């Protein structure tokens, strides 16, 4: 990815990312945008065209009016964790919402990167019309969905395997290489998806 392309992707994200009102960690918000800028520009442009917003938050997701209905609700795949949406730092699908400072694995989640995983859900649902539930991806998921760990979550829900694989592909060169070694059909699928 050349400098001009990274800059173009940051420019696209400038029309997608929404910052919280009040005090927040500006440097970490910027770092989150920079990580999102590694996503293929085709996906970012489609998010922009669909007026999908990536909402960065300084507090709990359920403190936002549009997610208050999820208070006390246990997310799909979080059964038995003892956590509810009140405790979850990122959400993706028809919208995207992300708590600043919770990007890394272990910050209330075990995704390789919070913002990439959550934004992958929106790309899957909005941009690619639920490709993770297509017959093609289900066949790939059936073979490789248990090779990235967390098999009772990633190995059970194809949309979650898609989102986490997407995060591996786009976070950095190391995670990209790990995905190719663990899940070669998934890697080739994502490679071809971006053409």
């Amino acid at each position: 990815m050349d400098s001009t392309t990274i800059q173009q992707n940051k420019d696209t994200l400038s029309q997608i990312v929404v910052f919280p009102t009040g005090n927040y960690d500006k440097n970490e918000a910027n770092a989150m945008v920079n990580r999102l800028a590694n996503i293929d520009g085709k996906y970012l442009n489609a998010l922009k065209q669909n007026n999908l917003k990536i909402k960065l938050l300084s507090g709990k997701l359920t403190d936002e009016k549009e997610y208050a209905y999820l208070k006390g609700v246990v997310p799909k795949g979080w059964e038995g964790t003892g956590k509810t949406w009140d405790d979850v730092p990122g959400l993706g699908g028809s919208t995207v919402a992300l708590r600043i400072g919770f990007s890394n694995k272990g910050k209330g989640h075990d995704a390789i990167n919070l913002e990439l995983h959550a934004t992958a859900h929106a790309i899957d649902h909005i941009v690619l019309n639920d490709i993770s539930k297509s017959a093609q991806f289900k066949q790939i998921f059936a073979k490789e969905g248990r090779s990235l760990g967390n098999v009772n979550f990633l190995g059970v829900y194809p949309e979650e395997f898609f989102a986490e694989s997407f995060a591996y592909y786009y976070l950095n060169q190391d995670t990209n290489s790990k995905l190719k070694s663990a899940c070669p059909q998934t890697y080739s699928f994502l490679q071809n998806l971006a053409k």
Binding site: L70, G77, W78, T95, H109, L154, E160
Partner: peptide, 7 residues
């Protein structure tokens, strides 16, 4: 649609 990260 709403989807969470990995627990």
């Amino acid at each position: 649609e709403v989807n969470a990260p990995v627990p």
